[PDB]
């Protein structure tokens, strides 16, 4: 039972963080936006003043739920359904 609306479509913190992360290309041709950049923490611990991984702290991913569009029917260029996905944005350092 669809609820159809019309839609018109028209910093190196990752390296300097004490919980640094890498950026993964999440690419899905069935989704708009097709490309989402997601974070993966580099280490389990956090970097200390000497540049070493200190495992008494935890690098953890900062996540959120966001809105994307999913092609429906599949491969449709002009019709979609709303979709909620969980994504990792960056990482932070937490006390255990």
Q: Using CB under 6 A as the criterion, which residues of the chain lie in contact with ligand XCE when the complex forms?
A: 23, 33, 36-38, 64-67, 84, 87-89
Question: Please, what is the Cα angle at 29 between 84 and 3, to 5 degrees?
Answer: 45
Q: How far apart are CA 46 and CA 95, in angstroms?
A: 10
Q: 70 by DSSP, 3-state: which?
A: strand
Q: Are 34 and 26 in contact (CB under 8 A)?
A: no
Measuring CA to CA, which residue among 60, 69, 47, 68 is closest to residue 96?
60
Q: Which of residues 57-96 bind a second copy (CB under 8 A)?
A: 57, 60, 62-64, 66-70, 72, 77-85, 89-95
Residue 61: CB minimum distance to a second copy, A = 9
Assess 13 for contact with a second copy (CB under 8 A): yes
Instruction: Report the interface residues with a second copy, using CB under 8 A.
Output: 1-11, 13, 16-19, 32-33, 37, 46-47, 57, 60, 62-64, 66-70, 72, 77-85, 89-95
């Amino acid at each position: 039972f669809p609820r159809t609306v019309m839609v018109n479509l028209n910093s190196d913190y990752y390296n300097r963080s004490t919980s640094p992360w890498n950026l993964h290309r999440n690419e899905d041709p069935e989704r708009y936006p097709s490309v989402i950049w997601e974070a993966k923490c580099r280490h389990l611990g956090c970097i200390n003043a000497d540049g070493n991984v200190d495992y008494h702290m935890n690098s953890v991913p900062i996540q959120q739920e966001i809105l994307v569009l999913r092609r429906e029917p599949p491969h449709s260029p002009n019709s979609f359904r709303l979709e909620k996905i969980l994504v990792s944005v960056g990482c932070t350092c937490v006390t255990p």
